């Protein structure tokens, strides 16, 4: 369809904030998955985890 530039920048900022929240919830999900994989010895979830942080993006969050 496109103050309009300000609206676009605000939308981008809101998207980035939602993305931050999503990433935090995803890291919490990965932690819960790790807990479940350690309880149930589910190698599948460990393979999923190794897939998820191939570039190590999630590795620092897991350490945190």
């Amino acid at each position: 369809l496109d103050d309009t530039v300000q609206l676009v920048s605000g939308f981008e900022a809101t998207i980035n904030k939602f993305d931050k929240n999503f990433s935090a919830h995803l890291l919490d999900l990965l932690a819960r998955l790790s807990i479940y994989s350690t309880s149930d010895c589910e190698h599948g979830m460990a393979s999923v985890i190794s897939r998820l942080d191939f570039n190590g993006f999630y590795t620092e969050r897991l350490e945190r």
Binding site: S47, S50, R51, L52, D53, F54, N55, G56, F57, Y58
Partner: protein, 448 residues
């Protein structure tokens, strides 16, 4: 309904690639040269409607458009048994038959002259598609027709079909060989300009890499155009296998390309093929494991891209998609990924999470495969910039020498200036740097 794909084959090289692709698809699907399904072609498991149309309940016609500005090649194609595979209503031929003279500017001018015919052909083919995703152009970037006419077609498709996907099969000029086409850097620049402004996806096909692979991997001392075309047809077949071997995943082009293009700007794709074998080595069906398959695929000798050894840039993979075809054990895939991670066989982007996607695919049932397992690699690797950087360096070498520019100034597209070539060179340099930047965490702010 399937998302039909119209295949546009442009210039001598592009038209040869398209013809060999249609031949290979017919052979894999058991389709006769006339477009009729052979009685042996009972495996209705392929999705032809993505790339082929049914002319009747029995006859499948390729959704292929053969486009040339010179009549010689089109007439030679029309003398093959496969003349009936393509819909003639989707074929636009330039009336002048003179070609582009290996001049991109001439190709663009010819496209402008055949614009009406080309868009009429495109619309006629579009109405035959139930859920047309977009158009796929197969062309060379070094010639005139496939480069110039291809760029014109891309521009007009972008203007007219802004809601359709645009994939290209773009044959890039050899960057390691001194091109006899002194205007190849001009042609390459115009093609890169259009890819930056008007293409959504550029599949780079480096003739230098094709020759290198034929020599080192196919053991072909002097690779013929025909052998390169057959290798390209094998690659295209592998790229279309997910359409030809339907499965649980990656059943659509957007699903295939999403993993390769993380951002709209990062739309430059590199290709990989597996298993790479010399024609003589067909004899031994090696029980290659997914780990073994990936390891051979990870070998540059098996890589379908000849990147120079850049000593200055720590090139890395931005993204990897492995399409594996044939009998695949999931546990072997898991072990392969495990071994790849343990061995750090792939470097991923530092600015975001990146990994090697692995797809397992069936082979075509109508074509007996000598190999139990085959594989395609799609990868975003910063060393592919070295091919692009090498092309840019050759462009700069010609532009700094103003070599053969008087012939382009003879053509209206280049008559007044070569500013499009210089902007293309700058954009390609920025692309090389971004591909190098994409190996670094600061790639998040790269290009800002």
């Amino acid at each position: 309904m399937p998302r039909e794909i119209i295949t546009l084959q442009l210039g001598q090289c592009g038209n040869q690639i398209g013809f060999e692709f249609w031949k290979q698809l017919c052979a894999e699907h058991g389709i006769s040269p006339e477009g009729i399904v052979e009685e042996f072609a009972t495996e209705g498991t392929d999705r032809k409607d993505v790339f082929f149309y049914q002319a009747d309940d029995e006859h499948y016609i390729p959704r292929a458009v053969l486009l040339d500005l010179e009549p010689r090649v089109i007439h030679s194609i029309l003398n093959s048994p496969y003349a009936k595979l393509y819909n003639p209503e989707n074929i636009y031929l330039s009336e002048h038959g003179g070609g582009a003279g290996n001049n991109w500017a001439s190709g663009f001018s010819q496209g402008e002259k055949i614009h009406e015919d080309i868009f009429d052909i495109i619309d006629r083919e579009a109405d035959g598609s139930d859920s047309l995703e977009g158009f796929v152009l197969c062309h060379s970037i070094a010639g005139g027709t496939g480069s110039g006419l291809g760029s014109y077609l891309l521009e007009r498709l972008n203007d007219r079909y802004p809601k359709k996907l645009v994939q290209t099969y773009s044959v890039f000029p050899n960057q390691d060989e001194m091109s006899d086409v002194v205007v190849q850097p001009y042609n390459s620049l115009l093609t890169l300009k259009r890819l930056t402004q008007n293409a959504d996806c550029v599949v780079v096909l480096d003739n230098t890499a094709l020759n290198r692979i034929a020599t080192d991997r196919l053991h072909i001392q002097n690779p013929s155009f025909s052998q390169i075309n057959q290798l390209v047809s094998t690659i295209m077949s592998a790229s279309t296998t997910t359409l030809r071997y339907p499965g649980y995943m990656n059943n659509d082009l957007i699903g295939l390309i999403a993993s390769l293009i993380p951002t709209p700007r990062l739309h430059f794709l590199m290709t990989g093929y597996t298993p790479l074998t010399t024609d003589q080595s067909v004899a031994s069906v090696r029980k290659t494991t997914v780990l073994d398959v990936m390891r051979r695929l990870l070998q540059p000798k098996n890589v379908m891209v000849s990147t120079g050894r850049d000593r200055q840039t720590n090139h890395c993979y931005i993204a990897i998609l492995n399409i594996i075809q044939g009998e695949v054990d999931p546990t072997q895939v898991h072990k392969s990924l495990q071994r790849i991670r343990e061995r750090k066989l792939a470097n991923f982007i530092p600015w975001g999470p990146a990994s090697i996607q692995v797809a397992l695919s069936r082979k075509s049932p109508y074509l007996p495969s000598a190999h139990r397992v085959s594989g395609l690699m799609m990868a975003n690797h910063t060393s592919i910039s070295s091919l692009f950087e090498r092309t840019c360096r050759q462009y700069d070498k010609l532009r700094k020498r103003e070599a053969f520019l008087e012939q382009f100034r003879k053509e209206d597209m280049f008559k007044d200036n070569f500013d499009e070539m210089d902007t293309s060179r700058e954009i390609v340099q920025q692309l090389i740097d971004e591909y190098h930047a994409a190996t670094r965490p600061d790639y998040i702010s790269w290009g800002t």
